[PDB]
Write an enzyme that holds these catalytic residues in place. Structure first.
Site, PDB file in Angstrom:
ATOM      1  N   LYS A   1       0.863  -1.163   0.000  1.00 40.83           N
ATOM      2  CA  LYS A   1       0.000   0.000   0.000  1.00 40.83           C
ATOM      3  C   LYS A   1       0.903   1.216   0.000  1.00 40.83           C
ATOM      4  O   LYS A   1       2.028   1.159   0.489  1.00 40.83           O
ATOM      5  CB  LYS A   1      -0.906   0.051   1.220  1.00 40.83           C
ATOM      6  CG  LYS A   1      -2.202   0.806   1.008  1.00 40.83           C
ATOM      7  CD  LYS A   1      -3.181  -0.055   0.187  1.00 40.83           C
ATOM      8  CE  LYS A   1      -4.543   0.556   0.127  1.00 40.83           C
ATOM      9  NZ  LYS A   1      -5.393  -0.349  -0.665  1.00 40.83           N
TER      10      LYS A   1
HETATM   11  N1  LIG Z   1     -11.224   2.079  -4.708  1.00 42.38           N
HETATM   12  C1  LIG Z   1     -11.097   0.764  -4.587  1.00 42.38           C
HETATM   13  O1  LIG Z   1     -11.015   0.017  -5.559  1.00 42.38           O
HETATM   14  C2  LIG Z   1     -11.081   0.155  -3.204  1.00 42.38           C
HETATM   15  C3  LIG Z   1     -10.912  -1.227  -3.077  1.00 42.38           C
HETATM   16  C4  LIG Z   1     -11.102  -1.835  -1.856  1.00 42.38           C
HETATM   17  C5  LIG Z   1     -11.338  -1.060  -0.743  1.00 42.38           C
HETATM   18  N2  LIG Z   1     -11.379   0.294  -0.818  1.00 42.38           N
HETATM   19  C6  LIG Z   1     -11.631   1.071   0.435  1.00 42.38           C
HETATM   20  O2  LIG Z   1     -12.909   1.675   0.320  1.00 42.38           O
HETATM   21  C7  LIG Z   1     -12.924   2.905   1.086  1.00 42.38           C
HETATM   22  C8  LIG Z   1     -13.354   4.034   0.182  1.00 42.38           C
HETATM   23  O3  LIG Z   1     -12.424   4.150  -0.944  1.00 42.38           O
HETATM   24  P1  LIG Z   1     -12.891   4.956  -2.252  1.00 42.38           P
HETATM   25  O4  LIG Z   1     -12.103   4.456  -3.426  1.00 42.38           O
HETATM   26  O5  LIG Z   1     -14.380   4.910  -2.400  1.00 42.38           O
HETATM   27  O6  LIG Z   1     -12.467   6.484  -1.935  1.00 42.38           O
HETATM   28  P2  LIG Z   1     -12.907   7.876  -2.604  1.00 42.38           P
HETATM   29  O7  LIG Z   1     -11.855   8.906  -2.371  1.00 42.38           O
HETATM   30  O8  LIG Z   1     -13.386   7.646  -4.004  1.00 42.38           O
HETATM   31  O9  LIG Z   1     -14.190   8.246  -1.716  1.00 42.38           O
HETATM   32  C9  LIG Z   1     -14.102   8.288  -0.283  1.00 42.38           C
HETATM   33  C10 LIG Z   1     -15.479   8.620   0.230  1.00 42.38           C
HETATM   34  O10 LIG Z   1     -15.455   8.618   1.680  1.00 42.38           O
HETATM   35  C11 LIG Z   1     -16.054   9.810   2.121  1.00 42.38           C
HETATM   36  N3  LIG Z   1     -15.587  10.145   3.456  1.00 42.38           N
HETATM   37  C12 LIG Z   1     -14.338  10.573   3.826  1.00 42.38           C
HETATM   38  N4  LIG Z   1     -14.235  10.826   5.107  1.00 42.38           N
HETATM   39  C13 LIG Z   1     -15.508  10.585   5.612  1.00 42.38           C
HETATM   40  C14 LIG Z   1     -16.060  10.692   6.909  1.00 42.38           C
HETATM   41  N5  LIG Z   1     -15.385  11.102   7.978  1.00 42.38           N
HETATM   42  N6  LIG Z   1     -17.370  10.379   7.057  1.00 42.38           N
HETATM   43  C15 LIG Z   1     -18.055   9.973   5.982  1.00 42.38           C
HETATM   44  N7  LIG Z   1     -17.646   9.834   4.724  1.00 42.38           N
HETATM   45  C16 LIG Z   1     -16.349  10.164   4.601  1.00 42.38           C
HETATM   46  C17 LIG Z   1     -15.675  10.834   1.065  1.00 42.38           C
HETATM   47  O11 LIG Z   1     -16.426  12.020   1.180  1.00 42.38           O
HETATM   48  C18 LIG Z   1     -15.997  10.006  -0.178  1.00 42.38           C
HETATM   49  O12 LIG Z   1     -17.398   9.934  -0.413  1.00 42.38           O
HETATM   50  C19 LIG Z   1     -11.521   3.022   1.691  1.00 42.38           C
HETATM   51  O13 LIG Z   1     -11.387   2.305   2.913  1.00 42.38           O
HETATM   52  C20 LIG Z   1     -10.690   2.260   0.652  1.00 42.38           C
HETATM   53  O14 LIG Z   1      -9.430   1.873   1.169  1.00 42.38           O
HETATM   54  C21 LIG Z   1     -11.235   0.927  -2.041  1.00 42.38           C
HETATM   55  O1  LIG Z   2      -6.973  -2.601  -7.029  1.00 42.54           O
HETATM   56  C1  LIG Z   2      -6.016  -2.683  -6.219  1.00 42.54           C
HETATM   57  O2  LIG Z   2      -4.934  -3.172  -6.546  1.00 42.54           O
HETATM   58  C2  LIG Z   2      -6.136  -2.205  -4.781  1.00 42.54           C
HETATM   59  C3  LIG Z   2      -7.570  -1.925  -4.397  1.00 42.54           C
HETATM   60  C4  LIG Z   2      -7.455  -1.166  -3.074  1.00 42.54           C
HETATM   61  O3  LIG Z   2      -6.107  -0.875  -2.792  1.00 42.54           O
HETATM   62  O4  LIG Z   2      -8.118   0.082  -3.154  1.00 42.54           O
HETATM   63  C5  LIG Z   2      -7.914  -2.078  -1.932  1.00 42.54           C
HETATM   64  O5  LIG Z   2      -8.224  -3.295  -2.122  1.00 42.54           O
HETATM   65  O6  LIG Z   2      -7.925  -1.609  -0.769  1.00 42.54           O
END
Ligand SMILES: NC(=O)c1ccc[n+]([C@@H]2O[C@H](COP(=O)([O-])OP(=O)(O)OC[C@H]3O[C@@H](n4cnc5c(N)ncnc54)[C@H](O)[C@@H]3O)[C@@H](O)[C@H]2O)c1
Ligand SMILES: O=C(O)CCC(O)(O)C(=O)O
Ligand SMILES: NC(=O)c1ccc[n+]([C@@H]2O[C@H](COP(=O)([O-])OP(=O)(O)OC[C@H]3O[C@@H](n4cnc5c(N)ncnc54)[C@H](O)[C@@H]3O)[C@@H](O)[C@H]2O)c1
Ligand SMILES: NC(=O)c1ccc[n+]([C@@H]2O[C@H](COP(=O)([O-])OP(=O)(O)OC[C@H]3O[C@@H](n4cnc5c(N)ncnc54)[C@H](O)[C@@H]3O)[C@@H](O)[C@H]2O)c1
Ligand SMILES: NC(=O)c1ccc[n+]([C@@H]2O[C@H](COP(=O)([O-])OP(=O)(O)OC[C@H]3O[C@@H](n4cnc5c(N)ncnc54)[C@H](O)[C@@H]3O)[C@@H](O)[C@H]2O)c1
Ligand SMILES: O=C(O)CCC(O)(O)C(=O)O
Ligand SMILES: O=C(O)CCC(O)(O)C(=O)O
Ligand SMILES: O=C(O)CCC(O)(O)C(=O)O
Ligand SMILES: [Ca+2]
Ligand SMILES: [Ca+2]
Ligand SMILES: [Ca+2]
Ligand SMILES: [Ca+2]
Ligand code: NA
Ligand code: NA
Lengths: 412, 412, 413, 412
Positions: D103
């Site tokens: 990460k």
């Molecule tokens: N993007 C991916 O493919 C992916 C994969 C697996 C897991 N994740 C996890 O999913 C979560 C969200 O990632 P994302 O890609 O959607 O991010 P992003 O930047 O696209 O969106 C984040 C969202 O969280 C909101 N947010 C931030 N702080 C907040 C708070 N205090 N209260 C409420 N809402 C709040 C933001 O306003 C926004 O709507 C994170 O934990 C990330 O690590 C992401």
């Molecule tokens: O697509 C990837 O390689 C990572 C996806 C992520 O990092 O947002 C996650 O799973 O937390």
């Protein structure tokens, strides 16, 4: 006899105007990424030295590794290589294959060099450009005056510097990682492109007459496949001369005669004609398959074809395009019609990097799908922009490159 | 004004004939090893894009890594860079330093760019050529429009791609591994060269009159060090204007005034003069220190100097050489007289690869030794071949390059 | 009782920044290391059971050249210590005017608790984990606490598998593998040169003065031996095993023989056992810490009896102690000058390696003396320009040189 | 809010004790392969400097190249990046994709930076880590505060150093080698995971009520696809506020409103609610889609959901797990439920290295297959070890990594 780069830049500027491209982006898109000129000096078979200049113009790599062939021909010069390289950029985008555009060449006359001299020249050229090409950087291929054997020598010499790298060149012999279908691909693609175009007018190849200028890798396969679709190939030329038969030439017999005698002259199945009347011969479809710039302001007015399909690179200059458009002649542009070669080169490259080869049926099926989809997207641009086929293809390709360029950005 | 490459090639062919070079070796030595043209696009400070074309001509590497500066000037174009690069090949050989010749540039007006824009442009140019240069391949340096700060940016950007590489560029700031003496080296070498020439007549700099065109890295140090040797610098020009004083200009005062005001011709210690009669001003020694081709068929007949010492690269074209010869003017050629810069660049490169810097007095004593030995070798060629100083230097350099080329051989 | 080593070093840096009037953005950039690396180092023990360590290499600053600094094997190695040591290497190389930046590495281990074969495996695995990060013109390690010339031989040998024979990738090597004559003794010898430079400003010399030395390894043994041979009286010495005193002066050569033979300073016939925590407060003219950092601190500085402190160890005095000692009139010659004989002769070793040709020891030690004399002169100049003490004279000298190189390199991408 | 790495290590140690993992192996699996912190200094648009610290924790590579996203968020610090990286290691193993875990991130507030600033920051970060990542070494992706455009800049800068390398980052724009389905993948996978969970109880999404915390890449797609499966999304929040509608929010309208106004507040189809009561809102399924650690010892006892599906990384700390288990709440763990992102990232990487892209139908079919299989293997572990869903997934992942580690061995 217009300058090749001036003609191509005129078409590019026209396409950019149709698109409304920003002037700074337009300028960047015109400027090649990198131009390379290298000394290529070899001992002849008798030990005496000869020096040539080798060229590789790397025009654009926004959409992926650059792609384009290597021409051995006495008229190769920087303007020609730049023009061909820029066309490869738009052609690859029109085909929707993940390549940008490049081209190379050496100003030489291959028929005046022995096979051993050609091999040494090819290997020295490879030694001089190996650090600038590569599987994910710039992937050459044949063009006029080169062939699959040339590519084998590039592969063999390149691999000394970088290990076995089959995907560094396409158009390879089958026994060295070449693709089934690649030898015939440009002519076969010309057939697909001609069929897509004629179908818009409710027509097919069967029974139509065709005139072909050039009888090499492109001209022979286009002539042979058109003939096997029922087309009447009524006149063919190459550097040695020209022949005609208004009932259609037996192309397979012509191929045998050419291989056996080295000439189109004295062919029993046709009549000698003057080579310089080939392009203005009566026909339904005229297919230039040799040099560029051959349809120009001096002869376009005498063209008798109803359709022109550009198998050669840039055979028609912009003066001729205007003269021909006024005559009602429809022109299927090079950057679409001859893209079967680079499309199947992409398939060859895919096969090499996947380490596993395809059956010929799959190669040719994918080629047909790509040519069909490209023609569909060209028609969309023609309708969106109320422009002709050349500008539909040119704007399609320019627009795709500009999009990828903008996504990648400009900060250092 | 004769084409720069055509002018240099005329001198080269003459030298080849004096040496009796085989015609195939002659042709090979003219053709550059590798010519590169690259797009250099940056965002300006306001975010809008500007595109430049960058050049690096790698002319010859038979004697070692290629060596030559980078010019930022609006008249940079392929013919100019090719001429400068070829001259570097002869100059490094005349100096007997283990380098070949190269040159680069960007057609731009540095005064029109901010410092941050110049830095971005320099770093992008470096990104576009980093794979072509290197400590043992091709080692740049300053030229018109670039300076030690430019070289710092090249070093810094190059080192991101290849690790810390102080010897990849010379003319560096002292604090980033530059050599003491390099800033002054071209002007100081011009002084040593002038002293060597004058001593053939029993003369010294002391008391003679000098005219200097240009007042940059070369012209300021030439004027200052001539002045400190007792020469009377009676006229100086730069892009802003020209100043004269037949008693001698206080050069140190002039340097202060130029730095304070950015101009020359309002200086208290001289009179403004028309810049276009500087080169024809009365003097013992005329030293062009700015652009090439400034002594040509239009003005050579009006030159009043007894001696010309070429500090600029190719300030005198062959038409002017012939006119000036008939007038009895003696011309000390660029590829000897201005070689102090590249000679001390060699010392800088040595110090970098040795990991240990020299005292300035060692640098300057070595420079003197090299310049004294090169003048003697030029005189030997002049006597052997009954030729003028330019051809003595040209034949010395070409012969050395041809010898290295022949030892390396031609098989693949 | 010690300040955090990085907090202590940053406090000195910020003061030097304030003296120089550094812009706040440059100040912040110079604090942030170029690159910090932490790597798993797991080996089989001789009995086949696994042990896992964490190795560190902090590459603090490379504006002035390849980074330089030793590798410490010691149980108290942690990120703060390695970061503090790496930052000090950046200023020290700049004070010495050698063309290097600053780095440091280490493994939190107890080398005495590992066999030679285990130490060799650990060293080779650490090299495997950082070989892509270091290099002759990138980052050149060396010994420090818990490592020695044999350690460097293993680094060289393992690194050269990846990159070909690369003698200049590490310094402090064995002479028989490309090491420099004079490098073993260099830090202690430079401590003598530095002490002689400082004392000369007061019209004094080593002869007849009394010295206390904390630590008796590479640095402490050579400082003690060479001071003794210049007529100094070494009246107390300690190492991890104990402390001994003799107010008439300890026979250092006899002590070296005894420690070699018994492994202990204790029960040396030529001195008296003392409490190791009263070593630093022993009466003397000159106190030379040669072991851990932070050993002069808020709790003991007010009891220091020395007139001069010469810092052979890295950061032995924290800023609280500096302030206490300054009020007592104690003059402190800073680590980033006084102990720079090691890295200076490492520079010479590196030069000899890349030049393919080794020097005589006389040349090495004459150059070391020239460099130490010139550095002290430049420190004195800064002290006079900025009306500051010796530590800040050296710190501002180094920070100013690094800032100048940084600004020349620029900031665009 | 508990320390993120302490919480994750507690889960890891719990899983290791369930497995009977050897204590030495356990310690090695905790220690990251390599932690990197680099200075990232850029000029702002006004030319003033700003310095950030960039992080890349490469936790484990026993099973293949490391994989995980880059977060631009003010709370990014070493503990958070270490915790997310360890979770990527177990997640990739649960999904049975041939990756390890890593990460990265930068502690910054992207909304306070211009687009040109964000691009320079991204490119400088890439310059500082390009030697440590790679197609077969460590492949980044988006996370909070980054998106496909961010990845395009990483690709573009990385390719300057290593040539065109589309597979070096995933989540790319389609027009630069991105995969169809990737943008929606995490939310779509959340739907699949929820469906597989609910099916175990003879339930499906249709008719149930859902609460979503976060409305970004993950939250918008999870909410959109749940709503299109007939789920009632009764409450949604993001950084700007929270809205509820007990009859279900029109998520398509909410997206359009969010786009136009930049806020969820004053949405015409919902009522404002206190965003710090979002997680305790009445519902069938609670889906955190924002920060980690948000369910902790203080609010877990007030949770009203029957199921928690963890779309965010580590939203529930171990204190909450116990409180919720005593309440009978079933928790579907992050390292399974949110694995659609990395699984389709794997497909993107495959497509790139194969040089040939897939249809979206195929991507999504494979995602479903992979999520169904991973859930089956989790249930097997839950039954074998008599443990809950989190430990079924965690033990599955740890055991697979430990096996690969043991096969590779430990000698030097
Ligand atoms: N993007 C991916 O493919 C992916 C994969 C697996 C897991 N994740 C996890 O999913 C979560 C969200 O990632 P994302 O890609 O959607 O991010 P992003 O930047 O696209 O969106 C984040 C969202 O969280 C909101 N947010 C931030 N702080 C907040 C708070 N205090 N209260 C409420 N809402 C709040 C933001 O306003 C926004 O709507 C994170 O934990 C990330 O690590 C992401
Ligand atoms: O697509 C990837 O390689 C990572 C996806 C992520 O990092 O947002 C996650 O799973 O937390
Ligand atoms: N080979 C490919 O895959 C490919 C792909 C797309 C486009 N093209 C273009 O197709 C054209 C032909 O290429 P090729 O591969 O067939 O080359 P080739 O060398 O195999 O054959 C060239 C043919 O043109 C003939 N020719 C040359 N000069 C002529 C002249 N003045 N008049 C008449 N005929 C003349 C030659 O005699 C020969 O018959 C070129 O424009 C090339 O750039 C080639
Ligand atoms: N810098 C070196 O080490 C070096 C080495 C050898 C030869 N040279 C040659 O010396 C010459 C000067 O180079 P430099 O490094 O001093 O460049 P510079 O950019 O430092 O200075 C150039 C000078 O020329 C002046 N100039 C430009 N156009 C002019 C014009 N039309 N009339 C009068 N003055 C004009 C400028 O105003 C300035 O004073 C060039 O020919 C260069 O190739 C430079
Ligand atoms: N070796 C070099 O070239 C060099 C260069 C500059 C500075 N330094 C610094 O010098 C100091 C000593 O390094 P070295 O190379 O001599 O190490 P070393 O491992 O050779 O010896 C360390 C000495 O310190 C002693 N020691 C350890 N803990 C102690 C304690 N609590 N009380 C008293 N003595 C203790 C050990 O017993 C041993 O005598 C360190 O600060 C090191 O960073 C070393
Ligand atoms: O197959 C290739 O890569 C190129 C085919 C060609 O260069 O001849 C062309 O399209 O003009
Ligand atoms: O110092 C150098 O290498 C460059 C010297 C120069 O290019 O300016 C020149 O000699 O013209
Ligand atoms: O010789 C070197 O490079 C380093 C010497 C040292 O690291 O021990 C130090 O100066 O602290
Ligand atoms: Ca371009
Ligand atoms: Ca040549
Ligand atoms: Ca820094
Ligand atoms: Ca581990
Ligand atoms: Na054993
Ligand atoms: Na700006």
């Amino acid at each position: 006899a217009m300058n090749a780069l001036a003609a191509t830049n005129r078409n590019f500027r026209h396409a950019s105007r149709i698109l409304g491209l920003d002037s700074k982006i337009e300028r960047s898109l015109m400027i090649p990424f990198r131009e390379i000129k290298v000394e290529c000096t070899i001992p002849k078979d008798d030990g005496t030295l000869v020096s040539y200049i080798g060229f590789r113009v790397q025009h654009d790599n926004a959409r992926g590794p650059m792609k384009g062939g290597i021409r051995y021909h006495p008229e190769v010069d920087p303007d020609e290589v730049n023009a061909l390289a820029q066309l490869m950029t738009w052609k690859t985008a029109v085909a929707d294959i993940p390549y940008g555009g490049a081209k190379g060449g050496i100003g030489c006359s291959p028929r005046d060099l022995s096979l051993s001299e050609l091999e040494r020249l090819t290997r020295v050229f490879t030694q001089k450009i190996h650090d600038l090409i590569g599987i994910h950087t710039d992937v050459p291929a044949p063009d006029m005056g080169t062939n699959a054997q040339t590519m084998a020598w590039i592969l063999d010499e390149y691999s000394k510097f970088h290990g076995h790298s089959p995907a560094v060149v396409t158009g390879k012999p089958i026994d060295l990682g070449g693709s089934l279908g690649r030898e015939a691909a440009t002519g076969r693609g010309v057939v697909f492109a001609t069929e897509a175009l004629l179908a818009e007018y409710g027509k097919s190849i069967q029974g139509l007459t065709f005139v072909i200028q050039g009888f090499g890798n492109v001209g022979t396969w286009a002539a042979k496949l058109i003939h096997e679709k029922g087309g009447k190939v009524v006149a063919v030329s190459d550097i040695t001369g020209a022949i005609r038969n208004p009932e259609g030439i037996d192309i397979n017999a012509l191929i045998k005669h050419k291989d056996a005698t080295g000439s189109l002259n004295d062919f029993n199945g046709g009549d000698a004609m003057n080579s310089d009347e080939l392009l203005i011969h009566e026909c339904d479809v005229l297919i230039p398959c040799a040099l560029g710039g051959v349809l120009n302001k001096e002869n376009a007015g005498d063209v008798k074809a109803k359709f022109i399909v550009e198998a050669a690179n840039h055979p028609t200059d912009p003066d001729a395009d205007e003269i021909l458009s006024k005559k009602g002649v429809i022109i299927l542009p090079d950057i679409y019609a001859n893209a079967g070669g680079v499309t199947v080169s992409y398939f060859e490259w895919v096969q090499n990097i996947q380490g596993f080869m395809w059956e010929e049926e799959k190669v040719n099926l994918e080629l047909q799908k790509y040519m069909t989809r490209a023609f569909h997207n060209i028609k969309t641009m023609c309708h969106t922009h109320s422009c002709n086929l050349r500008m539909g293809a040119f704007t399609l390709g320019v627009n795709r490159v500009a999009r990828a360029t903008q996504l990648r950005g400009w900060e250092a």
